[PDB]
Design a binder for this molecule. Structure first.
Ligand SMILES: O=c1ccn([C@@H]2O[C@H](COP(=O)(O)OP(=O)(O)OP(=O)(O)O)[C@@H](O)[C@H]2O)c(=O)[nH]1
Ligand SMILES: [Mg+2]
Ligand SMILES: [Mg+2]
Ligand SMILES: [Mg+2]
Ligand SMILES: [Mg+2]
Ligand SMILES: [Mg+2]
Ligand SMILES: [Mg+2]
Ligand SMILES: [Mg+2]
Ligand SMILES: [Mg+2]
Ligand SMILES: [Mg+2]
Ligand SMILES: [Mg+2]
Lengths: 142, 141, 266, 49, 315
RNA sequence: UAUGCAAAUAUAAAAUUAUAGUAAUUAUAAAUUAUAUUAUAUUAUAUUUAUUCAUAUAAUUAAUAGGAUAAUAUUUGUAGUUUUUGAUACCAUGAUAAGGAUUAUAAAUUGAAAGUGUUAAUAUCAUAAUCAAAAUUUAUUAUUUAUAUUAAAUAUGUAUGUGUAGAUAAAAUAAGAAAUUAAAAAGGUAUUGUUGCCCACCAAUUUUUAUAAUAAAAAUAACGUGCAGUAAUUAAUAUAUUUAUAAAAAUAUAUUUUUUUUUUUU
């Protein structure tokens, strides 16, 4: 890769813009996971049946010391709002916290409550060249 | 294949900015959601333009004859209950059976986005005058 | 001038043998005379090494839930751990305990030879999970920590030849080892046959066979973990007589004989 | 000539005919097949001592 | 070319080369190979045999008359591969009471042998009285002519080893060529138990006598159980017997001797728990058994160890 | 543009330079260096269709060990820490891609060697590797365009604008297209050869002397100008006269150690 954002920058090649078979791209990057729909609200990026049980990740499975963030496929439950306990999720740069609890979240997965690609951009994680290219696309002011 | 340049460090106080921005993006999304649900239901509940294309048959026929007779006397109540939404309208016509095989085959219906216009729509421009602040997938007025 | 990975280490074998044994020169591998293996790690170091090497699930990884650090740093940001008492308020605790990690013997073939659902593979042979001593699996005590270090850890020091050994194992390896490390003739010439936990089952089989229920009896014979006593074979064949079932009497007998130590020869 | 193929086959298939070779060899001659220590530019790396 | 070498079976550039068989030649088998037929190996497993009786078989020959007559008494004594838990006091009471009623010598003695074996498995010490009361008079005392039935002897011997008893030495001695000549009929397990007992008690001389007879009678040396050889050898502190035991150690095989060492190093080692009575310290015999093992194994070359201090000289 | 003055290549000579003591030589010509409109027959580029192109993450690579129906091994439970250093996040040679331009029709292929991350002798900063659910700046990518539109792994909310700039892409192959081609003569101060060599002024110094703005000459490896020369960016060479940061440049004559262009009365 051109820039190494992780270790894998060293190991992987891009291969230009290369086509992969349908719904298998090596890296699952869900840009769409928060993509508003009123009519599809309960069917989009959620369980295919409402009679399914909540995933593994809503439960404490073993003897734990504690966790840092809960997984993002965990589904937001009335207790998430009510209990007033830390609810963290791993997003980038670091972690997203649900601080301001609402019932409107309930019954959806935190995938869906966390905007993956923010309209906010750090100018300090960008090279002067990259900043130029972000000004061309009409994102950054200059 | 050049050795990948190292990525610059993250930013100072950008963790706070990202937290806040996502936080209130979500808070905003609650009202965007509330509002688009209101819109979706308001649309389902309100009347629409007639779904059939009158330029073809059996629909072109004068409103005092043929299919329109069949509608005024047998189907009217039902057609109004479903508010001329194009899906239940087409189904009711299948179930009235007095047209029978024609509904899909000889008859023509307006395209999706035109059939979705509110009843009373006069100019075509209306398709583009609906609210873009709301996430209904064109199911909003 | 000196860079080590580990500060200190220890001997696999103990004073009585070693103090005398040293006067006899032992040939070390010619190209790498000094051997520091995972038996030689200290207790602390072994613990650390054993936590790592298990991708996400494993206790080493900060977010597995088994982490003992109170703080972890993601890109200059310091995150404080959420204690489990607090995690539980919104995330209910459904925890069966260790019995949940061990299926019965009955299912060992469905599972390709295993009783243990833990994260590392568990071998029933002595050598793969061997530390200094021979590996032995407790089916009662299975934990995520794995104190005896009998599991096959993929990434630890010295792992590779163990992994290779595991991939070379014969078609019945798990099953055979499990069966031969338990179930063996006593030093007196007595049969292994009488065990306290299996006794009522054998009783039930006998009882069923005397009332002439051949199928129910055979269906219970299936669930026997240990060699069944002679009395079982007697009952079962006696049951085969009145309906003339010969094929069944014979397969019963042949089952108990020269498989199970010739309990059946009576 | 050059060799198209190679096979390991017992020596009794082709061995110098008994009237050509010296009389009983096993008994009257001590033979060892061994490798030259010195560097051999060309020729065989084994000889019969 | 590489750090990873080609594997000669899968590579056609090896297989079809001039040094091997090309795919256009006629593909028949080159020469036949008879390996297993010419020189065959005997089967010895790395694991011990799973069905073997592993005890001292006492050989119950009873006439099928007294066998039925005495059944309610014998049902309490060991039958083949079955060890009833009846308390030994009771069994001896039954013998003392009922045996004078039976008239057969052979029967009374088979029965006695069963009693002895039963008392060997419980380690009850008061059973030698039975030997002095019935057998001693016509077998061991004052050059009595009579020659005891083999099973009885095996049983009594087995009892003297299981319960460690000075008595064994008197019985054993009667079994050599000039006496009853029973020694060549002993099982390997018999020897095993004998050696182990003698070793615990600590008679170098018992150990020597027994190893000599075992060797002469052609016992199965390699299959004598290692633990018992080690416990016997461990008992040897006397200079002459020590000499004997070196010379003798050359009678075992390569493998046997390696595991003599392993077993020895374990019994004073990690596995010191495995014994009912802890070993006694012989540093000399330990060192020697290790040394012997090292001598008899194939030798490996570790040049950085041997020549560590080598300096060349121009003299 | 030949009335003053003015000997001067047409060869009488003994290795180059140098006022006849300086340095140790010099000079020289044919090997080699891709484009200068030479000719029918062995048969066609001026058609069609395209162009809004984005996607990578949460560190320990170092060894062997056999079991029922086998003539007997508890070898059940096989237990001797500690002297080395490269493929790593890092300098650490090799090797396969893509890229149409003239061996044609018959019984026949429209894809090439000149090398595109992962591979074998240069080590002497560091564990960075996927087992899920994750963060767009990267030349190198054919997407669904108006009757009916989210049900199983979770699967994309955005750009209707007169088929509309500039600039670009693809094809003569079971398809269907039909008329505006090249050869043969050429030079090297370089010597695996123009990314080749060389030329003067401009500093130091060395050495001989017949001391002219500032002596002359010879050795010489700095600095700074340029680009004089090798038919060399207005061809060079010699004499003559002028000019001048420096090679040199302008004009007047001769001349090829410069490459050639050729009417036997029209
Ligand atoms: O080779 C072996 C292996 C194991 N054992 C086992 O060690 C246990 C205690 O080890 P001991 O060997 O001290 O007991 P022991 O002499 O009383 O046992 P016997 O051999 O006389 O029965 C014994 O009770 C036996 O089960 C051996 O005796 N020999
Ligand atoms: Mg290359
Ligand atoms: Mg790893
Ligand atoms: Mg001078
Ligand atoms: Mg001068
Ligand atoms: Mg020039
Ligand atoms: Mg010029
Ligand atoms: Mg010029
Ligand atoms: Mg000139
Ligand atoms: Mg000038
Ligand atoms: Mg001039």
């Amino acid at each position: 890769l051109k820039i190494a954002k992780s270790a894998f920058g060293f190991y992987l090649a891009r291969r230009g813009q290369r086509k992969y078979p349908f719904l298998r791209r090596p890296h699952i990057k869900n840009t769409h996971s928060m993509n508003p729909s009123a009519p599809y609200f309960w069917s989009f990026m959620t369980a295919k049946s409402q009679m399914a049980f909540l995933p593994e990740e809503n439960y404490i499975t073993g003897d734990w010391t504690g966790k840092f963030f809960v997984s993002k496929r965990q589904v937001y439950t009335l207790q998430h709002a009510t209990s007033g306990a830390k609810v963290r999720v791993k997003s980038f740069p670091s972690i997203f916290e649900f601080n301001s609890p609402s019932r409107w979240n309930i019954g959806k997965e935190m995938n869906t409550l966390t905007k993956p690609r923010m309209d906010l951009i750090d100018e300090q994680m960008l090279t002067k060249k990259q900043r130029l290219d972000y000004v061309r696309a009409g994102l950054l002011p200059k | 294949w050049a050795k990948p340049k190292k990525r610059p460090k993250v930013g100072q106080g950008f963790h706070e900015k990202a937290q806040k921005w996502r936080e209130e993006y979500l808070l905003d999304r609650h009202r965007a959601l509330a509002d688009s649900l209101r819109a979706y239901v308001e649309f389902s509940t309100s009347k629409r333009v007639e779904p059939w294309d009158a330029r073809f048959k059996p629909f072109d026929r004068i409103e005092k004859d043929g299919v329109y007779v069949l509608m005024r006397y047998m189907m009217e109540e039902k057609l109004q209950l479903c508010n001329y939404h194009h899906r239940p309208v087409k189904r009711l016509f299948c179930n009235i059976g007095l047209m029978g095989p024609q509904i899909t085959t000889k008859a023509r219906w307006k395209p999706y986005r035109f059939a979705t216009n509110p009843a009373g729509t006069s100019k075509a421009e209306r398709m583009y005058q609906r609210d873009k602040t709301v996430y209904t997938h064109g199911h909003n007025d | 001038s000196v860079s080590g990975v580990f500060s200190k280490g220890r001997g696999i074998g103990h004073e009585a043998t070693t103090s005398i044994l040293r006067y006899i020169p032992r040939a070390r591998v010619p190209w790498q005379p000094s051997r520091f293996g995972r038996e030689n790690l200290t207790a602390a170091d072994m613990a650390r090494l054993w936590s790592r090497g298990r991708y996400r699930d494993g206790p080493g990884n900060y977010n597995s839930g088994y982490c003992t650090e109170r703080t972890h740093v993601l890109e200059e940001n310091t995150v404080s751990i959420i204690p489990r008492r607090e995690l539980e308020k919104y995330m209910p605790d459904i925890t069966i305990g260790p019995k949940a990690l061990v299926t019965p013997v009955s299912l060992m073939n469905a599972r390709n030879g295993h009783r243990v659902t833990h994260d590392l593979l568990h071998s029933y042979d002595p050598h793969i999970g061997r530390l200094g001593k021979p590996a032995v699996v407790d089916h009662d005590n299975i934990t995520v920590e794995d104190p005896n270090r009998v599991g096959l850890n993929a990434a630890t020091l010295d792992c590779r030849g163990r992994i290779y050994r595991w991939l070379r194992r014969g078609p019945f390896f798990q099953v055979d080892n499990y069966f031969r490390r338990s179930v063996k003739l006593n030093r007196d010439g007595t049969l292994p046959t009488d065990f306290v936990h299996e006794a009522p089952l054998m009783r039930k089989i006998i009882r069923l066979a005397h009332r002439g229920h051949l199928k129910a009896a055979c269906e219970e014979y299936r669930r026997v973990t240990t060699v069944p006593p002679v009395e079982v074979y007697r009952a079962l064949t006696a049951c085969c007589v009145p309906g003339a079932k010969l094929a069944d009497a014979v397969s019963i007998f042949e089952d108990g004989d020269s498989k199970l130590f010739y309990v059946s020869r009576d | 000539q050059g060799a198209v193929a190679t096979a390991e086959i017992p020596a009794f298939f082709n061995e110098r005919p008994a009237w050509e070779r010296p009389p009983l060899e096993e008994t009257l001659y001590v033979t060892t097949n061994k490798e030259r220590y010195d560097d051999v530019r060309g020729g065989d790396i084994y000889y019969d001592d | 070319v590489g750090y990873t070498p080609v594997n000669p079976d899968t590579s056609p550039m090896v297989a079809y080369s001039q040094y091997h068989w090309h795919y256009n030649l006629p593909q028949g088998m080159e020469r036949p190979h008879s390996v297993n037929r010419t020189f065959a190996a005997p089967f010895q497993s790395n694991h011990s045999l799973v069905n073997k009786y592993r005890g001292v078989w006492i050989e119950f020959d009873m006439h099928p008359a007294f066998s039925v007559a005495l059944e309610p008494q014998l049902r309490k004594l060991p039958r083949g591969r079955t060890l009833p838990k009846t308390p030994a006091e009771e069994v001896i009471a039954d013998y003392t009471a009922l045996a004078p009623l039976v008239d057969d010598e052979k029967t009374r003695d088979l029965w006695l042998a069963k009693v002895f074996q039963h008392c060997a498995f419980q380690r009850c010490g008061g059973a030698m009285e039975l030997w002095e009361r019935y057998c001693h008079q016509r077998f061991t005392a004052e050059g009595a002519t009579a020659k005891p039935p083999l099973s009885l002897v095996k049983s009594v011997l087995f009892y003297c080893n299981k319960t460690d008893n000075s008595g064994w030495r008197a019985l054993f001695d009667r079994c050599l060529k000039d006496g009853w000549n029973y020694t060549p009929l002993f099982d390997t397990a018999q020897w095993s138990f004998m050696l182990k007992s003698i070793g615990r008690m600590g008679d170098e001389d018992g150990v020597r006598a027994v190893l000599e007879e075992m060797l002469d009678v052609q016992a199965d040396l390699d299959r004598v159980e290692a633990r018992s050889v080690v416990i016997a050898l461990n008992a040897v502190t006397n200079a002459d017997v020590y000499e004997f035991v070196k010379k003798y150690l050359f009678n075992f095989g390569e493998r046997k001797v390696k595991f003599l060492r392993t077993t020895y190093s374990d019994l004073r080692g990690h596995g010191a728990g495995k014994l009912r009575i802890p070993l006694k310290e012989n540093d000399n015999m330990y060192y020697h058994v290790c040394w012997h093992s090292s001598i008899r194994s194939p030798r490996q070359f570790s040049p950085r160890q041997l020549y560590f201090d080598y300096t060349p000289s121009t003299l």
